[PDB]
Design a protein around this ligand. Structure first.
Ligand SMILES: [Cl-]
Ligand SMILES: [Cl-]
Ligand SMILES: [Mg+2]
Ligand SMILES: [Mg+2]
Ligand SMILES: [Mg+2]
Ligand SMILES: [Mg+2]
Ligand SMILES: [Mg+2]
Ligand SMILES: [Mg+2]
Lengths: 502, 502
């Protein structure tokens, strides 16, 4: 009784926003219904905040920041509180995993793995909090002392996507809290459940009023307030490229720093000297984990011409066996897509593939099976006889869809892999490790996997080249987005200059 | 015969742009006359480039970058070439100083000090080039190797201001070349002379075609191309806040990284326990070095009420003795302002001070003396009986003008100093070093001087909090703006996952 228990969890979950230490409704009492993508049933109703609520949260975050209660707390103590959040995630791993599956549709196994990652993100940043306060500089001016002090950047606004909501939240919350910033977070309007829950958990730990704030929904001009308010010091946005560009333009009005992660067209490069069985397995894993909606998805398969036919038929044969179903059922290998609008977007992209002349080798429709009929399912799809000039190869579909292109040589694989506007992540499969390393050094991607697909972890920075984003999350670089440098120069033997006549 | 020799230097200076290894005119043959602010005489005529020229330069920079001739050169070798530029600056220190004085009006002594700084900027980055290639990560996944590799960011566009043209150029050129980027630089249309000269010097050293490019002027949409072209990876702009905001909005269209330095309203905080003589000297130095046009200028004096009257009368008495004149004359302490438009801007700000009710205690007009009549001079000015609500206190005037406000307590000094939209630099004067350190830690400024005014140097990062900018120049942080991180993860014992049914 996995799903019905998860449903009973909801009877204890807050429905409200969290602003300045209090759970509160929307200023105009508006609500929004949240859906289970497996059966499209409404599972919960939450507040839908207004732009005045967002304004209020940002002003509270500012007041808290200036008060120093969190920003001037010792780094060691901030780290202890971030660890306490980590430990709460582990304590509540089952419930959180179940809530994530209910809200997003992914398999329970995927959700459990995700909860383990999230615990490790918090634990990583807890440990990093007190490890680097700045630098002493060897001043070139005699009788001076020069130091660089790291300070928290201030008030941060954090906007997360519907694909891996709590995971993306953790990437933003952990460094903000570790550094002493105040934050205002707004999860996707579609998938707020686990974010609400993590806010309840953070309240249990206890932070100064205003240090953490949660805004819910997609209210009119809320996004604009979060990117454009004069009191914001950093906007951290993960989501679609068009929204990201708008956010950056908004941020310019007050000279606000931005960190953006905007998607990808991630290549999966398979040489003829790859372990063949491995490359087929990982092409499946690349394409279809979380129904191709995880940000690391490998939608663009590039395979060496010599084995392309062999590869295509192996991949297609496997794709026909993929088990679709309820994320709570153990035999499910792939769940539904996230929303009606997203499935429609995916369907309109298949309109494009057809208008461009590509072949849908398998999939490309909604499944008919009775038990899948009420849910937001779409068949795992393989598109063949496509080329780099096509919209279906160039544009991010964010669904259970891969394209397959051939290449003759190493140089052509690199040129094709780099021929998109994006640059987030990708893989190279070859037993020739030297070759794989040559390719990796030429790919304009923030993360390159050699003989693997998907890995990310707190210890290493993640983010895009090209139009995939600005900045990095995770690792030390991720922490650094939340800090500002101040050079304090002291003249220890000050003398008159006497430039101007006396 | 200092000035006439500097004028004869010009008979050997290029008049053209430098694009893809060649000195070239503007695509439409347009030119612009360059003026000596001391006497408003036209001293030189240079090409005025078109937006198609800028496009061509950026495409050449891209082609050069992709070729690897500079980007894949060893860091050690790149450092050697950056050192060779440094050594050229020192070799030509006199000529460059004289050219800077001719073009910008500042005293020869100021220009010599500047040439020494510029040599040290290049030398610093030459030494930094080969010191950090990335990191090895302790991977949390068994049988994996994780490394982070630093790569140059790519094609950079660099736009510099008319206040300290070669110095600002050096801050941008040195890290770009040290990291292996290709660059396209466009100096202020008003003051191109020393930038043209440094390009001649860099050509003497020798770089691959397309690695360095120089665009001249303020042609229609040239700025827009430099901030908005798809092939740019970083825009580094130093100049006015309104242009900077436009640049950032442009950059958003292609998800282009930005580094901005946008001015300041730099406070000079003088406690009653300061060394009084020192504080008067440094208030003069803060306000009037380069006629208040250097980016470190201290236009906003905050003085403790107990000594405010004493301070005001000491400052005013000194301001009346400041020697205005030709930058080439040894007895000159302050030169002219940079342009007709800038002097007019300064004059319209005095219209504001008057409309707001402040007192012009000294100065506030153009000098009448016969030898100053043809030049762009403006008297050093002290404005009193002003408060933080006034436009003359809040807005950047960028001229030989200071305002004087009083404060009662340490807390009030901090609150007033922080009450502007800016956050570039400022000073605290007090013999109570502990107090000065408390104040420094509360000021939202990128650089805080304790008992000094003006110091900046290659070893320490420089840049703004708040609307003074995004990013940092100088130091390691300055280098880092020109680098991108790539995580290469290798699975050294790859295994099938077998998530999907066989
Ligand atoms: Cl090959
Ligand atoms: Cl005091
Ligand atoms: Mg409870
Ligand atoms: Mg020493
Ligand atoms: Mg800002
Ligand atoms: Mg010559
Ligand atoms: Mg080991
Ligand atoms: Mg970019």
């Amino acid at each position: 009784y996995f799903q019905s228990n998860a449903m009973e969890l909801l009877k204890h979950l807050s429905q409200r926003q969290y602003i300045d230490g209090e759970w509160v409704e929307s200023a105009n009492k508006n609500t929004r219904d949240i859906i289970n993508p497996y059966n499209q049933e409404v599972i919960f109703t939450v507040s839908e905040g207004t732009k005045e609520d967002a304004e209020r949260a940002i002003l509270a975050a500012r007041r808290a920041f200036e008060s120093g209660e969190w920003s001037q707390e010792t780094a060691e103590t901030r780290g202890k509180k971030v660890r306490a959040i980590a430990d709460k995630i582990k304590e509540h791993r089952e419930a959180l995993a179940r809530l994530e599956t209910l809200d997003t549709g992914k398999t329970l196994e995927e959700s459990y793995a995700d909860m383990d990652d999230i615990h490790n993100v918090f634990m990583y940043f807890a440990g990093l909090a007190d490890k680097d306060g700045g630098e002493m500089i060897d001043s070139p001016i005699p009788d001076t002392e020069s130091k660089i002090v790291k300070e928290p950047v201030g008030v941060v606004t954090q906007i997360t996507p519907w694909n891996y909501p709590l995971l993306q939240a953790s990437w933003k919350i952990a460094p903000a809290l570790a550094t002493g910033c105040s934050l205002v977070m707004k999860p996707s309007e579609i998938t707020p459940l686990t974010t609400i829950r993590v806010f309840e958990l953070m309240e249990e730990v206890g932070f100064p009023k205003g240090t953490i704030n949660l805004i819910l929904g997609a209210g009119s001009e809320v996004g604009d307030v979060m990117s454009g308010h004069k009191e914001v010091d950093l906007v951290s946005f993960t989501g679609g490229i068009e929204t990201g560009k708008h956010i950056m333009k908004n941020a310019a009005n007050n000279v606000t720093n931005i960190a953006l992660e905007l998607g990808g067209k991630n290549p999966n490069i398979i040489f003829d000297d790859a372990d063949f069985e491995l490359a087929v397995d990982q092409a499946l894993n690349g394409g279809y984990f979380h129904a191709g909606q995880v940000c690391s998805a490998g939608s663009r398969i590039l395979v060496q011409n010599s084995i392309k036919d062999k590869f295509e038929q192996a991949l297609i044969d496997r794709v026909k066996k993929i088990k679709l179903g309820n994320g709570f059922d153990a035999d499910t290998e792939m769940g539904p897509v996230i929303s009606t609008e997203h499935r429609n977007k995916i369907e309109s992209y298949m309109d494009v593939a057809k208008a461009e002349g590509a072949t849908i080798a398998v999939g490309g429709k909604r499944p008919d099976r009775d038990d899948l009929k009420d849910g937001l399912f779409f068949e795992p799809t393989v598109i063949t006889n496509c080329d780099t000039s096509m919209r279906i190869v160039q544009e991010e579909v964010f669904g259970p869809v891969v394209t397959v292109e051939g290449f003759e040589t190493e140089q052509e694989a690199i040129q094709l892999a780099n021929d998109s506007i994006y640059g987030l992540a990708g893989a190279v499969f070859s037993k020739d490790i030297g070759k794989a390393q040559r390719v990796a050094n030429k790919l304009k991607l923030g993360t390159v996997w050699i003989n693997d697909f998907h890995p990310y972890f707190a210890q290493a920075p993640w983010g895009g080249y090209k139009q995939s984003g600005i900045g990095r999350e995770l690792g030390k670089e991720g922490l650094e987005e939340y800090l500002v440098s101040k050079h304090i120069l002291t003249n220890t033997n000050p003398q008159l200059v006497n430039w101007f006549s006396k």
